[PDB]
Every structure is written in C-alpha cells, then in structure tokens.
Scaffold this active site. Structure first.
Site, PDB file in Angstrom:
ATOM      1  N   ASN A 250      36.029 114.655 -56.471  1.00 51.52           N
ATOM      2  CA  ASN A 250      35.480 115.671 -57.375  1.00 51.52           C
ATOM      3  C   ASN A 250      34.309 115.116 -58.218  1.00 51.52           C
ATOM      4  O   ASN A 250      33.388 115.859 -58.569  1.00 51.52           O
ATOM      5  CB  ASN A 250      36.586 116.306 -58.257  1.00 51.52           C
TER       6      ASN A 250
ATOM      7  N   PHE B 174      28.400 106.023 -70.586  1.00 48.88           N
ATOM      8  CA  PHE B 174      27.132 105.346 -70.891  1.00 48.88           C
ATOM      9  C   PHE B 174      25.977 105.991 -70.114  1.00 48.88           C
ATOM     10  O   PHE B 174      24.930 106.211 -70.651  1.00 48.88           O
ATOM     11  CB  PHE B 174      27.290 103.886 -70.492  1.00 48.88           C
TER      12      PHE B 174
ATOM     13  N   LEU C 235      18.680 105.694 -73.054  1.00 50.11           N
ATOM     14  CA  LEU C 235      18.045 107.020 -73.126  1.00 50.11           C
ATOM     15  C   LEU C 235      17.379 107.186 -74.495  1.00 50.11           C
ATOM     16  O   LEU C 235      18.050 107.100 -75.564  1.00 50.11           O
ATOM     17  CB  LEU C 235      19.110 108.125 -72.934  1.00 50.11           C
TER      18      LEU C 235
ATOM     19  N   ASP D  74      14.287 108.397 -65.868  1.00 52.21           N
ATOM     20  CA  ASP D  74      15.456 108.173 -65.064  1.00 52.21           C
ATOM     21  C   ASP D  74      15.660 109.305 -64.039  1.00 52.21           C
ATOM     22  O   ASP D  74      14.820 110.199 -63.902  1.00 52.21           O
ATOM     23  CB  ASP D  74      16.686 107.851 -65.936  1.00 52.21           C
TER      24      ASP D  74
ATOM     25  N   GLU E 117      22.418  99.653 -64.127  1.00 53.08           N
ATOM     26  CA  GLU E 117      21.207 100.095 -64.841  1.00 53.08           C
ATOM     27  C   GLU E 117      19.976  99.219 -64.590  1.00 53.08           C
ATOM     28  O   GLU E 117      18.830  99.643 -64.856  1.00 53.08           O
ATOM     29  CB  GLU E 117      21.441 100.222 -66.351  1.00 53.08           C
TER      30      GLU E 117
END
Ligand SMILES: Cc1ccc(C)cc1
Ligand SMILES: [Cl-]
Length: 162
Positions: free
Chosen positions: A132, A104, A32, A20, A11
């Site tokens: 995936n 997170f 956020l 972001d 981050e």
C-alpha cells in the site's frame, strides 16, 4: 547502520538549492526550504536557517547541522502526532528507522493520512503495508528515495542498505 547513515544514503547531499522529486526547493541532506514556487522565498528561508547570506550554497558542517535538526524534528513530529505515535511505539527498532525516514522525506501531514497503511503496520501486516506504501504519490514520484524504505518496512532488516 542507523538513521543518519540510512538518511545520507537516501538523500545524498546537495550544497546548492535544487528541486526535489515532488518539485520543491531543497538543499543539504533532504532539507526542504519551501513549497513555494518562488526561488527567492526559498532563498530567504535558507539564510534564515543558517544565520548568514549563503546565498544558495552551504558547507558540509552546516549541512550536518541542518540534518541533525531535521532528524530531531521528524522524531518530534511523530511523537506529537496522535495518529503516528501509537503506531510508532508498536514498531520494532529497524521499522522505527523506516518510519523516521518516511516522515523526514514526506512530512508528518502526508504520512498521517495513510490511515490504511497505519492500521496494517500496527497489526504487524508488513506485506500489505509495503504494497500500500508502494502505491502512494510519494513512491511513484520518488522511487529511488523511497524504495529502500518500503523494503525496510517489509523486512524489518537493514539488508536494503547493505
Ligand atoms: C510513524 C509512521 C511513519 C510512516 C508510516 C507509513 C507509518 C507510521
Ligand atoms: Cl527519486
């Protein structure tokens, strides 16, 4: 190496609101604020989070406070989700870090919808889960924030953060 250091690497750190990679308003270490398109709604949320008029700028200590609360909320979010918890609990120590990290970044809702990867992980099918996950909208949009986390689900080592 631990979840906090893993998250600081992924981050980094902003001390003023930014958008972001998913296009949402953020600050500190991946905090956020809102999914609203309105910068002013993201401003209320921030003041509301700190307990003062910032107005869009925070300190380091306050960033680490938010960070600590957000790691905690990610862990609690996993344990409270009936789809995420049994998968979490079967994972080894290091892959548990990759799971906290993903929740997170992405939040619980998005993650819980990877029914595919969730089964694969619980059956310990690391290569297929990895493949995936590298397919999600999260990876394609946030490839630098996401790459080390996928590699970690694959290997179960910390080598990606070294
Ligand atoms: C707990 C958990 C987190 C992330 C994924 C992709 C699966 C499970
Ligand atoms: Cl990115």
């Amino acid at each position: 190496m631990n979840i906090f250091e893993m998250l600081r690497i992924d981050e980094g750190l902003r001390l003023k609101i930014y958008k972001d990679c998913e296009g949402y308003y953020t600050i500190g270490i991946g905090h956020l604020l809102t999914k609203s398109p309105d910068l002013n709604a993201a401003k209320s949320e921030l003041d509301k989070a700190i307990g003062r008029n910032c107005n869009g700028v925070i300190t380091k200590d306050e960033a680490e406070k938010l960070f600590n609360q957000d790691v905690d909320a990610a862990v609690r979010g996993i344990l409270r989700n009936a789809k995420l918890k049994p998968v979490y609990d079967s994972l080894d120590a290091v892959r548990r870090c990759a799971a906290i990290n993903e929740v997170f970044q992405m939040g619980v809702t998005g993650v819980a919808g990877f029914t595919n990867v969730l089964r694969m992980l619980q059956q310990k099918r690391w290569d297929e889960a990895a493949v995936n996950l590298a397919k999600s909208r999260w990876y394609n949009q946030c490839p630098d924030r996401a790459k080390r986390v996928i590699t970690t689900f694959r290997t179960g080592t910390w080598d990606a953060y070294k």
